[model samples]
Target chain A: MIIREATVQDYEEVARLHTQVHEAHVKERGDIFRSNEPTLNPSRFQAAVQGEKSTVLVFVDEREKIGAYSVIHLVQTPLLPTMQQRKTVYISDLCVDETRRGGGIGRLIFEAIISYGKAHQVDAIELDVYDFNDRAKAFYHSLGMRCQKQTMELPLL
Target chain B: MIIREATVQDYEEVARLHTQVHEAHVKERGDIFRSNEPTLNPSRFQAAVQGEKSTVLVFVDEREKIGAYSVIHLVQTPLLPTMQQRKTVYISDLCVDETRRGGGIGRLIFEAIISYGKAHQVDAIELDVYDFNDRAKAFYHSLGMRCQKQTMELPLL
Candidate 1:
């Protein structure tokens, strides 16, 4: 499989993959989306195409179909006092087609993003993972992504 | 010069102070609201009232009126590969009343937030700040918040 930057043509497949990843949660919890209509998915695709601070990278197999993908959003942590001179990259979303998993496609796509990040002189890489996904946690750890912090929130009832 | 928890009566003043901070940014950069509207303000006030993950702390004057305030949103990080358990507090919004500036109210609120995090067994404290706010950046540094990572986004165009 070869990894490359995602183009507009990959939107549908990327969206499908994203929905697949979150499908379990959506089924178990009705509150996952504010509306049943997917909003952020399409907007993210458009942002990627419009050259927003985010990008979608896809892994294509020999047949030239998207097998896995990741979305990286570029954000500057203006709150970081010491590093006022540089910017960082935030990986907001990442997923691989379930049927295509265990074949190293996800790992390839991850490495590709890291490579891209390094070439662009990104100051750092960051992403948030749920407290549950044990498999994903191991995958990320294997790739040397250290767990730097945890985010907590208590919903006001 | 004492840091005290904000009460319901302080919401209006807190919101007004927050708007002041918001307007300052809008005036400085016309494009500030063009990209992202201020969606967290109302919810912040509501969180304060509802006792959600929201915590509002104020610097009270002798008259017991709020002279300055800071708000925090608590969030939990989803489970990840390496992290067996992760709990964190995200400081959603923080602002000091302009009229009460220079009395170290900001610092007190920050310390109190850290203390709260510790009390709640939070793993870390996180927040996002605009990259251009140098003064706020300095203030966060004074509170011992280390820059663990940076986020960057390049316009997809």
Candidate 2:
């Protein structure tokens, strides 16, 4: 498999994978998520793809079939004590093809992100994972990830 | 304690306490963080206090000593599956004076922030606590804050 930055041509596949992740969430968590549209917003993904700070990476195998993707945004926190001073790369999204799980595509994408961070001299890396996604949480842990924040929820309904 | 939005005059006390947090981290974590400024950048905090989406909350006592402060910003995640469209209230900074730790000021600040979230209808509340701050982690857990993301780090040096 080859890892490369996504171009405009990859938008369709990207949206398809993103839609899969969305459907999976609505299935596991129930009808809390409502969709008025058939596919995830392409304009938003396009904008992020072309935007200055957003970086999207895709991994394609010999068949030129994309198996996984990750989206990242570089930003700075203006108020935190340790984090306010330097740029932090936030991994906004990561998804692997359900059929290709455990084939090492996800790990390769992460290695690319780390190199991207080092080249950019980002101080830290950050991302958010849903509490219910046990596989994702453990996958991140395998990469030496540590919890910086626990986004607690109280369902006020 | 009274919970209210902070005005321009609270900048000094806010910066003072913010500086104390910065110092504590420097002492605890060493040169992992580098800075020459004696205090946090006032303009940054000032801008946040006055920014459109950012909200700075203060807990004032009968004597108006300003025992604690919390800064929150409402943001949307473009690429994430769960948090999209709706605003997420991120608690950027929550600090209670060392002399007033047990005065329940922290709780008051959180309550006020939650009220603000309800008013604005934010989808969730988020914040990052250093892994070393066990007391804070436990405190947040007590308030029903569950882990959403594990912000793992790798020193590329």
Candidate 3:
């Protein structure tokens, strides 16, 4: 198994996986997520893969098809409780294939994130997990992250 | 009192107020916010006021010395429970002067944000407040926003 930087050819597959992740949100959230046409827009995906501050990493198993992925961006803000810096890493999106859950794929991707953070000299890594995503919260907690803020919302109907 | 798009001349005042907000953070979060040379960078402030994607709004309570200001930007993410959209309004920074607090300047800026969202056809208005900022959270809740996500951190250092 190899986890590598996503390339242009991986665009369609990555976009497809992006939709799959959103589909889970749609199911859990019902009308809160809509998609007669689901996509991550290859153009935008392409932009990320090409942008210096944004990146898309994909995991491919022995058979060589993508099974999981993570999209991270170099974010600017506080880096430590004692230091505010401009180069923290933010995991904008991450997902494991539905059929491949429970195989430690998420952990592997997270490990890669830490490795990436170390090389980049970032002070920390952060992510946004919806309150409704209890398992995800628990998972992140198990990984030693702490809640920094609660992002409440009021969606207009 | 009047709330309107900030003009180039308002640059320094807005940047000053931006530092004021960070000073409050320095008091609350200590060195985690960094401030020996506190700044909202006049050039960057000027750039935002001129940038197509960002705009700063100032509130003038009869005198117009920029008693309060909000730096807003165009943001994109999934919106409705059933549909995904591109743009939303994200208030990156906002502050009402210490002497000007509780006279409802913050509320005015927030209301203006909603107005901007309506005209722009954006998904929602979002901002980040520290977990330690209860008053800010309460203020946002009072405006009818709910929690969309919980951002967590794992500081490497």
lDDT of each: 0.65, 0.76, 0.80
Best by TM-score: 2
Q: Residue by residue across A36-105, what tens digits does model 2's lDDT show? A: 4445577788877898999889999999988999999987656544544557788888999888898788
Instruction: Residues A1-157, candidate 3: write the lDDT tens digits.
Output: 9999999898767777788878777778753566645457767788889998998899999564799999999887746433565567899988888788898998999999998888888878988888788878887998899888776655544
> Candidate 3's residue-wise lDDT over B1-157, tens digit each?
7899998888777777877777777888662677655467667778888998898888987865788988888876656433656577888887888788777888888888888888888767777788888777877888897778888887876
DockQ score of each predicted structure, in the order shown: 0.06, 0.30, 0.36
Misplaced by over 4 Å in model 3 are: A1-20, A28-93, A96-122, A149-157, B26-32, B36-38, B50-55, B62-65, B74-83
TM-score per candidate, chains pooled = 0.52, 0.73, 0.69
Clashing pairs in 2: A146-B152, A152-B145, A152-B146
Q: For candidate 2, lDDT tens digit of each residue in B1-157?
A: 5788888888888877777676776666553554446466778888888999998988888574778888999876564445335467888888888787876678778888788878888777778777677877877887777665455555443
Interface RMSD (one decimal) of model 1? 12.5
Model 3 CA lDDT for position B86: 56
Predicted candidate 1 versus true structure: per-residue lDDT over B12-123, tens digit per residue: 6676766667766655543323222342356547667568677778877757467777777666656432122446677766887777779777777777887888888776
Instruction: Looking at model 3, give its docking quality level.
Output: acceptable
- Total backbone collisions, model 1: 31
